[PDB]
Design a protein around this nucleic acid. Structure first.
Ligand SMILES: Cc1cn([C@H]2C[C@H](O)[C@@H](COP(=O)(O)OP(=O)(O)OP(=O)(O)O)O2)c(=O)[nH]c1=O
Ligand SMILES: [Ca+2]
Ligand SMILES: [Ca+2]
Ligand code: NA
Ligand code: NA
Length: 319
DNA sequence: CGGCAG
DNA sequence: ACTG
DNA sequence: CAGTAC
DNA sequence: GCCG
């Protein structure tokens, strides 16, 4: 659509993200998306200024791209950015870890493997560096969800297991599998992890653990047989009282969740993976000094409704 | 000025 | 929400 | 807590 | 980076 611009802008956006300038990177991100929501190639500097999320600086840069044919700033990106991206693509390693590794002289994953002090999570991330960067076919994601469900419904047939994330949004490929487990009885979800995970371990399905919380588990799995890659797996067990808000959170997308939660804030409300709250007292820094009333949200439609929004099917949330 | 989801 |  | 991830 |  406007790929003549976005391509060059995405490079600068990633340059900012890996370097730790999150908000400026966030600004570039929102502009990139907007430039993807336009239908007519931007033709004037004031045409860009008309686009939401595009300002004078961004408008000017896009003007430079049209007449000049390229963005000059792209040529002053630090030489460190490719290395910082390489390092930050290790699961468990962020900008702060990547910059420190660079300051310490590390420039390759061979350096990291041989010299860097890695956390347990990071050592698992490095081991699966190539696999965690690969997406998977929807069909494989189905096999993985079913594998978790059968293991869960074996020790309690009432458990409800739902694959969320990009899968539920109907995407052709999934970066990783996101499973939401609950129980309609309101109490039978408690303490299932210990046995659910052990069942999944004894089979060989679960290969590594990254996070093991009371409510969330994040780890690595590999389906049986030949030609299989290691895949990232997220499991969240929640009380039935929050099933709707959790399903909405875990279905996403991430930018959809952030926009909704921002809307709730304007309307004096707060939306979380746990509940949609009202009468939310907030302070100067847009900060919640006091919580309010949990609003009844038995279904996803209730959240949309309580927020004054038309219901959006999961596939309509892929922002 | 300062938030940008929780 | 987790981790250390 | 800071860092990281979802 | 944008925007109220
Ligand atoms: C990463 C992220 C996810 N989420 C929510 C919405 C996501 O759909 C859900 C799962 O996270 P992800 O699995 O990271 O996102 P995704 O499944 O939609 O895309 P992908 O195919 O690459 O896996 O968690 C947030 O609310 N905020 C975030 O920053
Ligand atoms: Ca996912
Ligand atoms: Ca995930
Ligand atoms: Na990382
Ligand atoms: Na070295």
């Amino acid at each position: 659509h406007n790929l003549h611009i976005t391509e060059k802008l995405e490079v600068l956006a990633k340059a900012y993200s890996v370097q730790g300038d999150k908000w400026r990177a966030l600004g570039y991100a929102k502009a990139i998306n907007a430039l993807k929501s336009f239908h007519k190639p931007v033709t004037s500097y004031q045409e860009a200024c008309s686009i939401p999320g595009i300002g004078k600086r961004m408008a000017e840069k896009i003007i430079e791209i049209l007449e000049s044919g390229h963005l000059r700033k792209l040529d002053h990106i630090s030489e460190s950015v490719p290395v910082l991206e390489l390092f930050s693509n290790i699961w468990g390693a962020g900008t702060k870890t990547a910059q420190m590794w660079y300051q310490q002289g590390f420039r390759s994953l061979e350096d990291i493997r041989s010299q860097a002090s890695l956390t347990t999570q990071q050592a698992i991330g490095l081991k699966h560096y190539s696999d965690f960067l690969e997406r998977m076919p929807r069909e494989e994601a189905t096999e993985i969800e079913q594998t978790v469900q059968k293991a869960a419904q074996a020790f309690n047939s009432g458990l409800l297991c739902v694959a969320c994330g990009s899968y539920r949004r109907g995407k052709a490929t999934c970066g990783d599998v996101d499973v939401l487990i609950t129980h309609p009885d309101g109490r039978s979800h408690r303490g299932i992890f210990s046995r659910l995970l052990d069942s999944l371990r004894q089979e060989g399905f679960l290969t590594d653990d990254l996070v093991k919380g009371e409510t969330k588990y994040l780890g690595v799995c590999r389906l049986p047989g030949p030609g299989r890659r290691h895949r990232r797996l997220d499991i969240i067990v929640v009380p039935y009282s929050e099933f709707a808000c959790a399903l909405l959170y875990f279905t996403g997308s991430a930018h959809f969740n952030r926009s909704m939660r921002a809307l709730a804030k304007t309307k004096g409300m707060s939306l979380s993976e746990h509940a949609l709250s009202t009468a939310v007292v907030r302070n100067t820094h847009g900060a919640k000094v006091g919580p309010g009333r949990v609003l009844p949200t038995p279904t996803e439609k209730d959240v949309f409704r309580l927020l004054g929004l038309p219901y959006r099917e999961p596939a309509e949330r892929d922002w």
